[PDB]
Structures are given as structure tokens and as C-alpha cells.
Amino acid sequence: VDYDDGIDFPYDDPPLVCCFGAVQKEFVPVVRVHDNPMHPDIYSQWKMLQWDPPEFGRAPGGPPSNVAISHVRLGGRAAFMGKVGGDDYGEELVLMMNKERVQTRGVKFDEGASTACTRVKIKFEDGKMKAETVKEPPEDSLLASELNLAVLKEARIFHFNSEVLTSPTMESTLFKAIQWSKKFGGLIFFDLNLPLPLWRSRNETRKLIKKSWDEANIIEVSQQELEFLLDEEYYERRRNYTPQYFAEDFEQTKNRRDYYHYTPEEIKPLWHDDLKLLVVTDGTLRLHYYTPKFDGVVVGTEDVLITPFTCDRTGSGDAVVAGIMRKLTTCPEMFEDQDVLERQLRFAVAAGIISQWTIGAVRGFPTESATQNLKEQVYVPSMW
Template sequence: MASQAPLIVSFGEMLIDFVPDVSGVALAESNAFIKAPGGAPANVACAISKLGGSSAFIGKVGDDEFGYMLSDILKKNGVKTEGVCFDKEARTALAFVTLKKNGEREFMFYRNPSADMLLKESELNINLIKQAKIFHYGSISLISEPCRSAHMAAMKAAKEAGSLLSYDPNVRLPLWPSQDAARDGIKSIWNFADFIKVM
């Protein structure tokens, strides 16, 4: 049963993706968009639960309709949400994404700053992190403070509790100040991971 399965905790961003209602068009060419839950770490948490595992999510969304929608989607998918925080000052992150005719994805992000970027170390549910058999995270949460410090503290707590660390670099260059900053940031935690998703 899922409740007896080892807990996998995902940490990072959860956002709303807006995708064109027709395929193969650039964002500017789309006449309408469909909203969809997104954020790689949150997607992993939902997938684990759907496959019969036990999962939890730690991250921050806005104290807004999209934030509560995303939290409810986690709950409906059987993901533990006691690690989700709501920010009254910042909005839930938004991303517009399309798959163009040439097969390349095009992204446009709205996070200036978004709530996920403002997660503080003091807001971490450390007890939940310590229960994790596997602690999974990406690189987006490394881009700016205070989330970077929260990310590092969460990794440290998980490792000290004996968790295996799972890392999805999830390269999104438009979010970083430069390609060099992205490379340095992503590689800065490379050697701590027990598992790394490479594509």
C-alpha cells in the first residue's frame, strides 16, 4: 500500500503552465491557451503517487487562486502537502510554453519574483524532510535567494537523516542571469547527489 511505501519528498517549484490550444505554433501565434499544472519537482511527486508510491512536496506558491489550485491538485493525486507554503506578497509562478514545428520548446516565464523563489529556510518542514527515503530536487531553486539557502538547508537535513539525494538539473537557461551562471549553479551541487537525471 502507498501509505507503507518509503516516502519520497520532492522540493522546488510548482507553477501554472499555459500551453497553446493548437500544436506547432510559436507563443505569439497562439490565439488561446490552456492552463496546466507544472513544475518538474511537483510533477515527480504526482507521478510517484500515481504509481502507488508515497510522496510529499515542499515548496511555495502564492496565496492566490492558482496557488490553492495547485495545492488541491497535489492532494487529489495523493501527495502529502504539509510542506507547501503560501506567500501573501508574491504570486504563483506562470510559464507559457509551446512545442514549435521544429520540435523545439519555447518558454516565457513570469516570476519577478514569484512565490517559489521566496521560500525561506525557516519555512521548511524539516520533520517531513527527515522522513524521506529519497529527497528529490531540481536546479531552479538554486537561482536566487532566499530559496537557494532553503534548498541547501533541505539537502543537508535530508542527507543527515540518511536520505538518498535525487537531482534533476532541469536546465532552463532563460531563468538564469547567464549561461555561465547556469553552469556554475547546476554543477555546484552535482557531487552531493546519489542519483542524477541526465538527458
């Protein structure tokens, strides 16, 4: 807006990344309707949905603090920008991030608020129960004057989710943070992770995210989010088509799973000038990538049935994003070299796979050497 902040410094390696939003424990934001529910009380059956998940939950994302923790464990450096209350739960969240060696100088305390607590009022409009927000939680109440500009000056990637778009206060604060980061040369990473309200209608969501979509240099979306934003019914019809008499080629006879790679012309409504990399994730199975110059897909895999009693997919979406951010900062040729980009994205695939082998997102985030080991075990040496 006006000037700089802090003292210019040689800025130790690896380059810092900043994660913006709400620090929460667990809290899966992406919620849709699944048609295969287990017993409502016997939660010992619910693990069967971890190894036959709904498609929107194949590699779930989470709060931005998950990405920061996962990024640090993968060998990077990260700082979290956000607000917590001055109560005991607020200290626990900060102590969790300090233990994981995430910088918390960008975390502001609000001594008059209770962490993760929203005051709402219950109404009975048209014979139905609804709630409306009376006072937002401290997590969604960071002000622009409370931004740590030293972090925004140092950080090379600014990362945020669409959960901040559900808060009037955070949305205004978000666009001041983006302005500062761009002024200092930072790249903007938009990890969509649509919360429950934003799944209601395509047109309302497209209007709501359009401004933040246009400010982003890197975007990660799931296959379900991308199809919802373009046309959900066209792609479902496309998946359900079966030739009447004979297959068009030998591969169509095998009745394999659909890994459709969207053409850059289908993606065109969502492309803009400043966008450097679009990644569409089909869990860890496929990573479709799109650049101004080229596009392609990285083939991955998953194995949660290798450990049926400890598998938990929560947080695996954050590990994939953290793995992308770890390689983008240290391998800047990823943006311009296709072969280099594919090799580096296989590192992100491996991180997602390991993350699904432990109960709890933070508890199961993998280290760099474990991720590198799994990548070399899974892929043939020519693909490393």
C-alpha cells in the first residue's frame, strides 16, 4: 500500500512460505452427500469408508495450518498468518505449531475471544430451523492492520483456502495480504478446498471465488471441484457412456477406471493471464497439471488396504499441496520444463500416499526422507 516493513536480510534457505487462514485441529471442510452410510452408532465400521471413500473424500484437504505443518516436515520453512483467542485452546493450537517448527510471529492473539467458538442465533423461518452469525470466531477475524509484513516480505509463496471467503472480515483482510505479497514478489497459491456452503450452486460459487481466482498464480483443485465449477452433469454423463455394439479401441474393452484428462479448451473459462500452474488432483491417483505452454498428467497410486486398521485419508490433500510447494520453491524450472515438473510432482504423490497410512492429519504427515524413499520404491529408476 505505502512502503515496506522490517530490515532487509539475506533470507535463509529454503525459501519461506506463508499460510493464511484459520488454524484448526482436523476439521474437514469439503462436505457433500454420500450414498453409502455405515451404522450410525458403531464407529468401528466407519473405517470401511476410509478404504472405499466417496470420490470427494479420496484425498481430503483441511485448514491452512495443516499445509504449514506438512511443509515443514517435508524440509521447508513456513509461517502461519492468522488469529486465535487468548484462551487455553488458543495456546494449544499455537503450541502445536511451535512444536512442528512453524513460525508463529504472524499469529495474533485476541484476548477477548474464545478460540473456535462462533456465537449464532437460531431462527425458525418458514417452518425450518436456520442459524445466523452474531459474532465471528477469532479465527475469522484477522484485520489488515494486524498483518505481519515482515512475513509477507520474506515469504515466496502465499497460500490460502476458500474458507476465508465465507467470512466478511477475512475476505477484506485477504486481499490486503495478497497486495502486499505481490508487491514483494511472492507467488499466490489458491488451494480451493470448497467448504459445505460453496457446494450449493455453481453460479453463486463462481461469482464468490472469481476475484480470488484471478489473483492466484498457482491453483490446486480436486477433480470434483473442477467438474462442479464447469459442468457437473456433462462429465457424469461422459463417465457413464458405454458403446452399444463394440468398443472404439482395445483399451475401452477392459472397463477400467476413468482417468479423463481435461483438455486446455475445457479449462479455458477458468484460465487467466497471471496463472502459472493449475493442478487437478484425482486423489493421489492422478495429478493433472496445466501451464500456459503445456499440459499433462502424472500417474500415481494409493494403498490404504496395506494397513486397514490405521488408514485415514484426512490430511492427505494437504500433504500433496505441501509437497508441491516444497518442490516449487527449490526447483523453479518446474514452471517451464515439463519433464522436470513431472518428476517433482511424483514427490508430491508419494507424500500423499504416506499421509493416508496414519490416523490423524498432523500425526501422520511424512518427513522428506520417508517421502523420497517411497518415491524411489514405487517408481522405476528412470522416472525419479
